[PDB]
Amino acid sequence: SYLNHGQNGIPPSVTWNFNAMPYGKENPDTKTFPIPD
Amino acid sequence: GFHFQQYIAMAGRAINPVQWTRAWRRMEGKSATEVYRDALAWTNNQFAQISRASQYRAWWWQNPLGMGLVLYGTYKAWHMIYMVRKQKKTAQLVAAAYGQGGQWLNPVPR
Ligand SMILES: CCCCCCCCCCCCCCCCCC(=O)OC[C@H](COP(=O)([O-])OCC(O)COP(=O)([O-])OC[C@@H](COC(=O)CCCCCCCCCCCCCCCCC)OC(=O)CCCCCCCCCCCCCCCCC)OC(=O)CCCCCCCCCCCCCCCCC
């Protein structure tokens, strides 16, 4: 009976944040194809 | 150049409010053409005094560069009093809006 003394949802499996987004003029994590001049 | 003290005194009288009422009374029966002609005549009288008296008279500030130095000094005073003040204000404005040097930032990279 003590198994039901305390289930809204669950904790998130993964999280995404702003610092995970890349930035940089030279950083190749932002370069897919060259932008025309 | 000459009569800088008189010019300072003129500015003082102009800022004095009582002189505002005096000028309001003097402007009774007066035209914009007359006012403009009077101001232009005053300026011409100053410059003509200079042109005439520089031929034979020397002021206390006479120097091997003549009135060029007095004119440069007038310009430098104007600069430091007005333009550098405006620069200070603009600097504080830019530093509050974008950060120091924000007006010289490079465009956002693409
Ligand atoms: C601080 C300087 C730096 C300024 C900021 C930086 C700017 C750099 C750019 C410079 C550009 C200069 C502008 C050039 C344009 C032409 C200007 C010009 O020739 O006519 C000026 C003008 C002269 O008018 P004028 O048409 O030739 O007619 C002359 C009269 O007939 C009278 O006839 P007179 O024969 O009896 O005398 C003729 C003449 C005689 O002028 C002279 O020959 C100078 C006599 C002394 C020789 C050594 C000069 C330098 C060292 C002593 C003076 C220190 C002050 C610096 C003065 C710089 C100008 C030389 O009279 C004067 O000019 C008096 C000036 C000295 C006033 C002293 C006031 C002391 C208060 C400040 C505390 C002490 C100083 C603190 C330390 C500052 C260090 C930077 O001088 C005035 O300022 C008129 C004052 C009217 C009364 C105002 C109420 C009193 C307030 C006193 C301060 C007045 C403003 C001066 C500010 C400087 C002191 C803080």
Written account of the structure:
The structure is cut from a larger assembly and holds chains A (37 residues) and B (110 residues). With 37 residues, chain A is mostly loops. Chain A is rod-shaped. The termini of chain A are far apart. Chain B is mostly helical and 110 residues long. Chain B is built from four helices and no strands. Chain B is extended and about 65 Å long. The chains are: A little secondary structure (37), B mainly alpha (110). Chains A and B meet through loops of A and loops of B. Cardiolipin binds next to helix 1 and helix 4 of chain B. The site of cardiolipin (CDL) has 13 residues of chain B, from helix 1 and helix 4. It is classed as membrane protein. Keywords: mitochondrial, ATP synthase, lipids, membrane protein. The entry is titled "Cryo-EM structure of Toxoplasma gondii mitochondrial ATP synthase dimer, membrane region model". Chain A: atptg2. Organism of A: Toxoplasma gondii (strain ATCC 50853 / GT1).
In short:
Chain A has 37 residues and is low in regular secondary structure. Helices cover 0% and strands 0% of the residues of chain A.
Offer a few descriptive terms.
part of a larger assembly; 2 chains; A: 37 residues; little secondary structure; 0% strand; B: 110 residues; mainly alpha; 4 helices; extended; binds cardiolipin
SSE topology:
This is part of a larger assembly, with chains A (37 residues) and B (110 residues).
Chain A: no helix or strand
Chain B: H1 4-15, H2 17-26, H3 32-53, H4 67-97
Bound molecules: cardiolipin.
PDB class: membrane protein
Keywords: ATP synthase, membrane region, lipids
Entry title: Cryo-EM structure of Toxoplasma gondii mitochondrial ATP synthase dimer, membrane region model
Largest interface by Cβ-Cβ < 8 Å: A-B, 4 and 2 residues
Structural class of chain A: little secondary structure
Number of strands of chain A: 0
| Small-molecule binders | cardiolipin
PDB class: membrane protein
Keywords: mitochondrial, ATP synthase, membrane region, lipids, membrane protein
Entry title: Cryo-EM structure of Toxoplasma gondii mitochondrial ATP synthase dimer, membrane region model
Chain A: atptg2
